[PDB]
Design a protein around this ligand. Structure first.
Ligand SMILES: [Mg+2]
Ligand SMILES: [Mg+2]
Ligand SMILES: [Mg+2]
Ligand SMILES: [Mg+2]
Ligand SMILES: [Mg+2]
Ligand SMILES: [Mg+2]
Ligand SMILES: [Mg+2]
Ligand SMILES: [Mg+2]
Ligand SMILES: [Mg+2]
Ligand SMILES: [Mg+2]
Ligand SMILES: [Mg+2]
Ligand SMILES: [Mg+2]
Ligand SMILES: [Mg+2]
Ligand SMILES: [Mg+2]
Ligand SMILES: [Mg+2]
Ligand SMILES: [Mg+2]
Ligand SMILES: [Mg+2]
Ligand SMILES: [Mg+2]
Ligand SMILES: [Mg+2]
Ligand SMILES: [Mg+2]
Ligand SMILES: [Mg+2]
Ligand SMILES: [Mg+2]
Ligand SMILES: [Mg+2]
Ligand SMILES: [Mg+2]
Ligand SMILES: [Mg+2]
Ligand SMILES: [Mg+2]
Ligand SMILES: [Mg+2]
Ligand SMILES: [Mg+2]
Ligand SMILES: [Mg+2]
Ligand SMILES: [Mg+2]
Ligand SMILES: [Mg+2]
Ligand SMILES: [Mg+2]
Ligand SMILES: [Mg+2]
Ligand SMILES: [Mg+2]
Ligand SMILES: [Mg+2]
Ligand SMILES: [Mg+2]
Ligand SMILES: [Mg+2]
Ligand SMILES: [Zn+2]
Lengths: 98, 60, 80, 118, 24, 127, 206, 155
RNA sequence: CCGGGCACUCUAACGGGACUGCCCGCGAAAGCGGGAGGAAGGAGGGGACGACGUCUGGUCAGCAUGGCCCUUACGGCCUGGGCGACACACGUGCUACAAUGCCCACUACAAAGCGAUGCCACCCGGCAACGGGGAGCUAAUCGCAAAAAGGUGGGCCCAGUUCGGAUUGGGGUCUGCAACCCGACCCCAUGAAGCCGGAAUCGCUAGUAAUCGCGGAUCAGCCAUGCCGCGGUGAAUACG
């Protein structure tokens, strides 16, 4: 069991990093279950537009934290040969729980 | 707001209840979002600038 | 419906002052800026001047008013 | 059906008809029907002399009731009134006590509106 | 209805619990 | 053998499986009349089969979820429609003139700021 | 009272954040504060060096502060000297062991914040604002830039009453978010008052 | 309707009769968006009205709604000072709407305790030619034939 | 639940799909009326977006800022008090005046969010607020959680009431250094006005109004009935 929790503020960044990881691991390992998508944490913030009222003008923004899962099955060495540190994306964030 | 009234930053408030948010940039007295540490006006301007990652224009 | 639930809170300020005042006999007017504290039994008989926020008003403390607070007798408001 | 200090409900459900006693609401009515061993859904007319006498035994002396209760509440008012308490002052001036606003909608405690000019 | 705090609807409107609206 | 129709109505999903039989329809471990007990519009769910003369020619098993029970009934209607069409396509000639193959796209509309519920404006008095 | 900030509109499509990293409940606050400190420092020192954008990226305690300059000679300095002091002063505020990066921006008149800084400079020394405006719009228009626009604030030339200045050219459609409209604001602090300078620049289609 | 004709909503047919007027009446009985409770009201009233009088509730419903539909009414028209009550005929759609509204409003103005009982007895009286809804209808018609002196203000 | 499988609902990334393209009609054209096909059409529904300018509109009390006044002092710390005052007047709302209703058990169906001392399954104690113990969830797996109207069953019987919960007396929990001024909540008791509202006036044209609950931000706590979102059921009418 090698869980790879992928999280980010950018969906294309998550897709890029996750697909690169899976492409690296596909040359060594099993019929990997691959890139499963998880629901996104949506944080909304409503803000009154103008300081010092005009109460009914407020606009809101939304941040969204995207999550992806990998679940590599039976990776041995060549998988982690292409894994240690080779990635470009910066806004991506990776965790590994076993 | 007032410099001295950001006295919360050295917290030592003599009592744990007297902690308030006091938005970092503008020194907001009343309305502060705890997650960004900013206030609605500072949050508005900073999200307009593009310095808060992931913040988009909500629409649905 | 009023509740303090355990170890009924009385500030140290008048606590030590009055428990040492009782040992030498009843004293005259006392100074009180702490109306946050609860009245205790041994306070009966004294004359406690409490703060309105502006003024110093004397209060005769009796057996009937033990359970209440100092400040129930110092009206902050002024009307008519 | 006389139960407490003078109190005669009639022609209704017993637990409901006990609310008409001063110191009894729905809670104490359900408690009386519970511990007295009486069917709550019974009409007042069908109440046994033994059922009525047991209800009298319980309700009469377990809680303070009509005259004693009215005088106890009024004497409590007088008690916190003769002391110089702020609550007593609010009872004196005829203003709400629980800590509400008096700028608007103090009608229940202050009585009908007396409109001065402006 | 909703203002009666010793009934069940007044309990769900205030969201609290007690004798007239036990939890479970 | 068996034919499948899904259907969807107002945030509800009603998977419908149709086979031949006597006319007994069950839902989620209950008969159709025990789960929708005492609902006057519950007969509209088996309405799409009255242009095809089922209920004695057919038999069903349905699994429904989401929303309210009225949306469940209408999603059952639509799912029965698509299962009936996949059974016999000619049934379309008697279905769309009745309107049983159209997805009802009426959704609850989102709430907007400055309003109470998405269109009600707050009342002003002395403008 | 209309016309919301254009870059805030643009953040989603055809524009990117000045900071692109990830955080959670326990980290975002003081990390954003650290970003604000970085930009504060670089706006204290590097104003006259011709800087436009500061892009900060984080992977894992790795910082990638990227300074886009119109004149990299003042940022690097002779023999690299100046990439030693304020690159160490940068790490004397944050203990994150952060390194600094420089990048070139062509046509300082094509970047809207730089044009705003330029017009604000010419305003602080009290030039006739309309000539600076039209000249800036021409500097923009003389190299691609299918649209250009300049707005100046009140108390123009020191006048007692506040006014509003003008003279855009080409086509500057702030309404439609399609075609990479860049925006820059500058603040001219003078004896008579304060003059806000808004530089809108339109270039490219998709 | 400044621009368009405001095309009439076509109500869904009914599950019991298959008739549209029944669905319209059930909508007129519904309040707070409870079409289920309103349908139960109308159909328990249907059972009661079919039992207390051994006739089909279909034709009694139809005959009652037909008896309540008025043929003339009054509208106010501003002419030479204060406006006047001018009589005129009625649209069939508006006749339908007014008939159903008077039906429901006269049913709920009845003394009967339960809702379905009120609905059933109101439908019965309206089907016989009497009742409150028909009284309001005949007052509407009595407004006509009375201010008929303004028959030259038809507009 | 397991073995197992992706077909299904789903989650979330890229696409397909509508263009008056086909036909009848009318027309010089745009286009209009009608019809089939289609999930959908004549802008399919909802947003984000608000022109040159206007009213010397709004806030230097968010910020930044140009000038004029303050300096044992307007600056500054802390305690107490205040912004909560009441003989009145309006604005916005909440709850209601009941039988299409209330209460009591029993049972079923949402979406959107939130939670590392933070959400708190579960056992115990207590009528209860809540306390003790304690599992799990770095959360499509755990928890907030029960959705509420609804369904069947029952009681109420047109009555200031088994409507309505204001007021007030007492008892108690909780956050907090501390609830007199001035908190929320629980329990007993008290059970007020109010039986559809004068002149006048407001919102809404389709899932809309109406009604029902849920969540969130700010926050130790909370006077939130506010505000910002979510879904459940679901109208009436537009001659003009
Ligand atoms: Mg507001
Ligand atoms: Mg200042
Ligand atoms: Mg605080
Ligand atoms: Mg605060
Ligand atoms: Mg006075
Ligand atoms: Mg009640
Ligand atoms: Mg919706
Ligand atoms: Mg709704
Ligand atoms: Mg207004
Ligand atoms: Mg700039
Ligand atoms: Mg000039
Ligand atoms: Mg663009
Ligand atoms: Mg398995
Ligand atoms: Mg496949
Ligand atoms: Mg057509
Ligand atoms: Mg057609
Ligand atoms: Mg068609
Ligand atoms: Mg559209
Ligand atoms: Mg649109
Ligand atoms: Mg659209
Ligand atoms: Mg547009
Ligand atoms: Mg102005
Ligand atoms: Mg003003
Ligand atoms: Mg200044
Ligand atoms: Mg105030
Ligand atoms: Mg559970
Ligand atoms: Mg999972
Ligand atoms: Mg699961
Ligand atoms: Mg998971
Ligand atoms: Mg019943
Ligand atoms: Mg009365
Ligand atoms: Mg009562
Ligand atoms: Mg009544
Ligand atoms: Mg409209
Ligand atoms: Mg809260
Ligand atoms: Mg209060
Ligand atoms: Mg709420
Ligand atoms: Zn601020």
């Amino acid at each position: 069991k090698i869980r790879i929790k992928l999280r980010g503020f950018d969906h294309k960044t998550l897709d890029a990093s996750a697909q690169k990881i899976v492409e690296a691991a596909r040359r060594s390992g099993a019929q990997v279950s691959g890139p499963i998508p998880l629901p996104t944490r949506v944080r909304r913030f409503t803000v009154i537009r103008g300081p010092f009222k005009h109460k009914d003008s407020r606009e809101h923004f939304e941040l969204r934290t995207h999550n992806r899962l990998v679940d590599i099955i039976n990776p041995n060495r060549k998988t982690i040969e292409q894994l240690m540190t080779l990635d470009l994306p910066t806004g991506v964030e990776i965790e590994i729980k076993t | 707001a007032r410099k001295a009234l950001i006295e919360k930053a050295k917290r030592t408030p003599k009592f744990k209840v007297r902690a308030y948010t006091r938005c970092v940039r503008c020194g907001r007295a009343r309305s502060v979002y705890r997650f960004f540490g900013l206030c609605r006006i500072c949050l508005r301007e900073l999200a307009h600038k593009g310095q808060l990652p992931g913040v988009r224009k909500a629409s649905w | 419906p009023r509740s303090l639930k355990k170890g009924v809170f009385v500030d140290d300020h008048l606590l030590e002052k009055v428990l040492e005042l009782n040992a030498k006999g009843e004293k005259r007017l006392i100074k009180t800026w702490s109306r946050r504290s609860t009245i205790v039994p041994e306070m009966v008989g004294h004359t406690i001047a409490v703060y309105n926020g502006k003024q110093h008003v004397p209060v005769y403390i009796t057996e009937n008013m033990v359970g209440h607070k100092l400040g129930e007798f110092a009206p902050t408001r002024t009307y008519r | 059906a006389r139960i407490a200090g003078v109190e005669i409900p009639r022609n209704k459900r017993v637990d409901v008809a006990l609310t008409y006693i001063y110191g009894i609401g729905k809670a104490r009515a359900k408690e009386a029907l519970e511990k007295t061993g009486i069917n709550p859904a019974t009409r007042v007319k069908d109440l046994t002399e033994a059922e009525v006498v047991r209800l009298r035994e319980y309700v009469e002396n377990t809680w303070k009731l009509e005259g004693e209760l009215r005088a106890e509440v009024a004497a409590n008012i007088k008690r916190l009134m003769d002391i110089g308490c702020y609550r007593g002052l609010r009872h004196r001036r005829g203003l709400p006590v629980r800590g509400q606003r008096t700028r608007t909608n103090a009608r229940t405690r202050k009585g009908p509106r007396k409109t001065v000019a402006g | 209805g909703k203002g009666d705090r010793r009934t069940r609807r007044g309990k769900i409107w205030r969201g609290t619990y007690g004798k007239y609206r036990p939890r479970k | 053998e068996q034919y499948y129709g899904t259907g969807r109505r107002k945030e509800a999903v009603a998977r419908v499986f149709l086979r031949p039989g006597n006319g007994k329809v069950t839902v989620n471990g209950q008969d159709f009349n025990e789960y929708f007990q005492g609902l006057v519009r519950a007969v509209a769910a088996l309405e799409p089969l009255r242009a095809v003369d089922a209920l004695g020619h057919f038999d069903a098993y349905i699994t429904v979820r989401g929303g309210g029970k009225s949306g469940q009934i209408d999603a059952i209607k639509l799912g029965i429609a698509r299962a009936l069409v996949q059974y016999n396509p000619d049934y379309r000639a008697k279905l769309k003139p009745l309107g049983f193959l159209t997805r009802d796209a009426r959704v609850v509309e989102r709430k907007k700021y400055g309003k109470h519920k998405a269109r009600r404006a707050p009342q002003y008095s002395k403008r | 009272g209309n016309k919301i900030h254009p870059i805030g509109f643009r953040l989603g499509i055809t524009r990117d954040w000045e900071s692109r990293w990830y955080a959670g409940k326990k980290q975002y606050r003081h990390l954003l504060l650290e970003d604000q400190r970085i930009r504060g420092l670089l706006e204290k020192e590097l104003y006259s060096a011709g800087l436009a954008r500061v892009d900060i990226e984080r992977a894992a305690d790795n910082v990638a502060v990227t300074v886009h300059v119109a004149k990299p000679g003042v940022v690097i300095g002779r023999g690299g000297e100046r990439i030693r002091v304020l690159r160490e002063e940068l790490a004397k505020l944050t203990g994150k062991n952060v390194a600094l990066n420089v990048q070139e921006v062509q046509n300082p008149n094509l970047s809207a914040p730089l044009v705003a800084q330029r017009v604000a400079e010419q305003i602080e020394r009290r030039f006739a604002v309309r000539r600076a405006i039209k000249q800036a719009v021409q500097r923009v228009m003389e190299s691609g830039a299918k649209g250009a626009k300049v707005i100046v604030s009140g108390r123009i030339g020191g006048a007692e009453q506040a006014r509003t200045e003008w003279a855009a050219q080409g086509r500057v459609p702030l309404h439609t978010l399609r075609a990479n409209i860049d925006y820059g604001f500058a603040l001219a602090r003078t004896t008579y008052g304060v003059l806000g300078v808004k530089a809108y620049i339109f270039l490219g289609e998709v | 309707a400044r621009r368009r004709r405001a095309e009439v909503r076509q109500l869904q047919p009914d599950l019991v009769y298959g008739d549209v007027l029944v669905t319209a009446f059930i909508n007129k009985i519904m309040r707070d968006g409870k079409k289920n409770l309103a349908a139960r009201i109308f159909y328990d009233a249907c059972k009661i009205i079919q039992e207390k009088t051994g006739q089909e509730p279909l034709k009694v419903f139809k005959q009652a709604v037909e008896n309540v539909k008025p043929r003339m009414e009054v509208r106010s028209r501003r002419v030479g000072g204060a406006n006047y009550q001018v009589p005129m005929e009625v649209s069939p759609r508006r006749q339908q709407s007014l008939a159903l509204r008077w039906l429901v409003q006269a049913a709920n103005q009845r003394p009967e305790r339960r809702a379905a009982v009120r609905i059933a007895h109101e439908l019965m009286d309206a089907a016989e030619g009497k009742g409150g809804a028909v009284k309001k209808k005949e007052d509407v018609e009595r407004m006509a034939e009375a201010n008929r002196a303004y028959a030259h203000y038809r507009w």
